[PDB]
């Protein structure tokens, strides 16, 4: 059943040459090319990069049929944070998630003047000020590195996921998440105040003399201990009939 779900829901475009990766990526959630609202540019502030990257983003939009008049709105967060080589993509991946969940597209506040060269790329819009929109559907984080190390990632808004699940299930989920948030707000203000945020683990979940038994039972899972109250593997849950029954 899972494989059928896969064939028709998840990977229907894998073996199709008329559906691009980018196309189908969006298409699985009922999203069109035009739905990719924001492009998180690598924006290195170098002459080489910024032009190339615009051109290449422009072309991937042009080829896939982006409606004339609907440009991608590009952010360039390197303007605020700088360029930490490796940590670049991640920082942009964060800002992308924050954009998705806020509907706010921040502005390249250091765009005194958009390079006149870039006018040709009619599918790109370079904002100098923050736009609070009524929604963002998908961001595109792209980054380039030395040695022809190119890379793209498409992040789609979370609420499209909940569409594919039963109402009773969704409701059950909201319940758990709510309880977590409360208990995490708890945790966070504790560790802020008392500098307890990082707490190094001084033991593994398994005793040394139980280490191998755990690695080998695929159904072995942790339970709260009585004495310590912390999460350990029990002798009674390792290779148990009960854990084949309840699985």
């Amino acid at each position: 059943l899972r494989a059928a779900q896969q064939q028709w829901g998840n990977d229907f475009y894998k073996r199709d040459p008329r559906i691009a990766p980018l196309r189908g990526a969006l298409a699985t959630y009922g999203l069109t090319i035009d739905d990719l609202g924001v492009a998180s540019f690598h924006g290195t502030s170098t002459k080489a990069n910024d032009k190339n990257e615009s051109a290449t983003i422009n072309e991937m939009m042009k080829h896939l049929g982006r409606s004339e008049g609907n440009p991608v709105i590009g952010v360039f967060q390197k303007f605020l944070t700088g360029h930490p080589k490796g940590a670049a993509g991640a920082w942009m991946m964060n800002g992308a998630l924050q954009i998705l969940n806020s509907g706010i597209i921040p502005g390249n506040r250091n765009a005194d003047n958009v390079d006149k060269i870039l006018e040709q790329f009619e599918y790109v819009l370079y904002p100098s000020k923050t736009l609070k929109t009524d929604g963002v559907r998908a961001v595109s984080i792209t980054s380039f590195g030395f040695g022809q190390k190119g890379g793209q990632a498409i992040v789609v808004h979370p609420d499209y996921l909940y569409g594919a699940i039963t109402e009773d299930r969704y409701n059950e989920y909201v319940a758990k998440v709510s309880a977590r948030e409360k208990s995490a707000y708890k945790f966070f203000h504790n560790g802020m105040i008392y500098n307890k945020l990082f707490v190094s683990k001084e033991h593994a979940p398994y005793t040394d003399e139980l280490e191998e038994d755990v690695y080998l039972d695929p159904l072995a899972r942790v339970s709260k201990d009585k004495k310590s109250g912390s999460l350990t593997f029990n002798s009674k849950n390792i290779q148990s009939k009960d854990s084949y029954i309840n699985a």
Binding site: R109, A111, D112, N113, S128, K129
Partner: protein
Amino acid sequence: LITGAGKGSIGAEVLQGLLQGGAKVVVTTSRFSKQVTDYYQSIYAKYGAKGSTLIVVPFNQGSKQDVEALIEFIYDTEKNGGLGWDLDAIIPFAAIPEQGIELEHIDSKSEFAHRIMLTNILRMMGCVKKQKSARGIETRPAQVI
């Protein structure tokens, strides 16, 4: 060319007008900052009409050397690092606030202020005259408000 067009002034209201009409304008600022650069990019991205262009330069109407340097950078061919322009209007609104200075108080400040507000304005008109003239520009007067 417009001097004295800082934020919150008759200057900046005239500047917004000019830009809205598609003019090509050089604005002088005395306090050239990020804070001030950011002001003008804001102003341009709001009123910068088709065919308009704003150029912000740091400037001190009190310096003979700045007066000369400025309007030279305006007339000099782009190749030579200039602007390649020819002025049609000059609005020398640049000044310094003298208050609580009576006759017997007139000193260093007022003499300097008099320089910015009169002698160097003369010098400035004089400068663009030489440029135009040294180029046979006899049919394109610059209006001085």
